[model samples]
Target: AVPPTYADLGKSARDVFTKGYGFGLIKLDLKTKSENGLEFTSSGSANTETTKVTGSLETKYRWTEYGLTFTEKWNTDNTLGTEITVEDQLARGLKLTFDSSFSPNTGKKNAKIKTGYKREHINLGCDMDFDIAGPSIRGALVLGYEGWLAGYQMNFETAKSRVTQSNFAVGYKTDEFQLHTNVNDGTEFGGSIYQKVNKKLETAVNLAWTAGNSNTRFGIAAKYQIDPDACFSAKVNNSSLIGLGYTQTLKPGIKLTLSALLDGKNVNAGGHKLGLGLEFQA
Candidate 1:
């Protein structure tokens, strides 16, 4: 069994509603890799209602012999970012990564160090901010037994001498289905379940509430695969918002995705959105 990180506790269910459903934007992505382990990806997107376009490019190279990796990214806003990762350099199942981003115009920089170690039954992860004036550290511990997992995470700021965030999560997962629950700061509660109904269909439902809040939010989503190259997804939430998405592979390494969001209660009231995306890879 492999233990999951705190942030990955409910990833499966959450991704169903958040991933591949781009609304009100047009996007294009290109990705390719070379035989020498060098990879490049570029993405550009624009809001449907805005004239400005945003773009970014990222490059990554891996030194497999030394278990090291390097990545660099550049954004349209003139932000430069870099990351270096060392895997199993100190011990098996251990990884260390350093990431930093710089804005030349503003002369501002941000950096962080992250490390993770995984064992058969336990996982440990930590992140340290590279802030000299107000340093902070976040850590998580997860344990797994059979198909059940439990995890705890917290963040502490040295300058404030206070804990800024604390969370607990528990989950059960198997090949066919998964269930997850988490509590944040003893106030916000959330739960989700993902089920693989068959070889062609998958579904997920999520709920969230606060300890003092009178209302609970809920959402359900489903994805159906029509064939090897086509699929459709639908999602609905408590707020009468409905989302529909369709994905089709136009070629072996090319895909097109279309998505729309509609106001279920007032379909004719003019609050509808549509998106189109194209991706190419080799």
Candidate 2:
């Protein structure tokens, strides 16, 4: 298992708010794996509003003994992305990654290099982004002991010699529940909690407020495993927006997901959203 780095300090509660909820999404994926650590996946998605479709094919290969991995992706719109990762090869608990993307249609290119190290008491990560015009770097650090964690992240602009972004986070965790709070760019303060009510149910709550503004946001989300093959999720926010999601395993290699968004304040106003997804692997 991979250890949590600085960027993952509050990922548990954050995932509840960010994952598995969408509107007007239609996606399909087909994946295959080789016996020799090779994998290929073809994915397509359609915009329900305009009926525009897009797709990409991705392939990845890994060398387990060498702790190395390579991935390539080609998009239908003449864009290509590639990544190389090395883990535990140079030193234990250390990982290095390189990424590049090119858009042939626009003649645009971008690249990035990242490094991270994790240990029982500390974790560190840094990345440099390369654009067609220039480059910038960001750094992050986290310290944790016995389920209590604190972390900071910053992005520095090389050209201006200025700090463009800064954030701080702290959290405490246990097997059944976790709590997290963070300050984003020193402007907004947010807190979240993730709780496992039972073997089948998980719940989360998130709240945020600006440092000097009265505006606030709050949301609660929950997921329940109905059976071994099916699951359900629900989320509601302070603005009276509700999201419902469901996933089911149709067969051993096939799965389906459905999601809906509703306006609770004005149910009959006609603005609602829905999504469908299908995935297959062999």
Candidate 3:
């Protein structure tokens, strides 16, 4: 099956989640920063089960208008993934970026090369993600269109000409509303809508249907910004699973979040969750 052609979004296709936080999947994360753009982060889960911890190191360096960033992720025993990214400004509205990551255990590797151009009236960008295994390559391009329709974007996958699990999309966005739609080879259709209710409230609705397989899903999410330092969100998926979350800021550059989930499918366990997250920067 092919993936959705959603290349331009800052987030991945799976990240187009209609659900907020999973309560049963409770977890906590914390970050600490030092001078020179170095940051250390550690995270773990404190559920009813065992306790395990993971650590990651991140740092970025800049010189002569160019910068490179490195990230290392490790469990208590083994290193999982390490990544390096580089960014550069070619000119007034042109930029380039490259990302590479590797797994320490299986020696697998993944990399992406991206470049973008921005100007007064239009913007264009393309990116390619490849792996070292077959060096499998997937590429996509994005075009920005505005004016008659306002905020709009088009994305296309250049890797494969025709395939299933495949799709195409057209999107419109504005300060108050956003909509994106996709149609897949007459087999499936999916879309998402977002609305800004007011200054601090927003809602998202999503739906997907696959005709051939008779598979379908729907979900909703809502968020309310309590203030500059706090916010709350809720979500419910088609599975009847519900989640609630809240985030708070302790002080300057410091923040924390809590999340809980409710399981309705299985009346046995009902549902219980305790999630926590913390981050700080200097």
CA lDDT, candidate 1, residue 149? 90
Error of 2 at 39 (Å): 0.9
Q: By how many angstroms RMSD does model 1 differ from the true structure?
A: 1.3
Give lDDT per model, in order. Answer: 0.92, 0.87, 0.59
Q: For every model shown, what is its TM-score relative to the native structure?
A: 0.96, 0.93, 0.71
> How are the candidates ranked when ordered by TM-score, highest leading?
1, 2, 3
RMSD of 2: 1.9
Instruction: Using TM-score, give the best candidate's number.
Output: 1
**How many residue pairs in model 2 have overlapping backbones?**
0
Residue-wise C-alpha lDDT for candidate 1, range 152-264, written one tens digit per residue: 99999999999999999999988789999999999999999999999998899999999988999999999988998998999999989999999999999898999999985
lDDT of 1 at 94: 97
Residue 187 in candidate 2 has what lDDT? Answer: 96
Better of 1 and 2 by lDDT: 1
- Models ranked on lDDT: 1, 2, 3
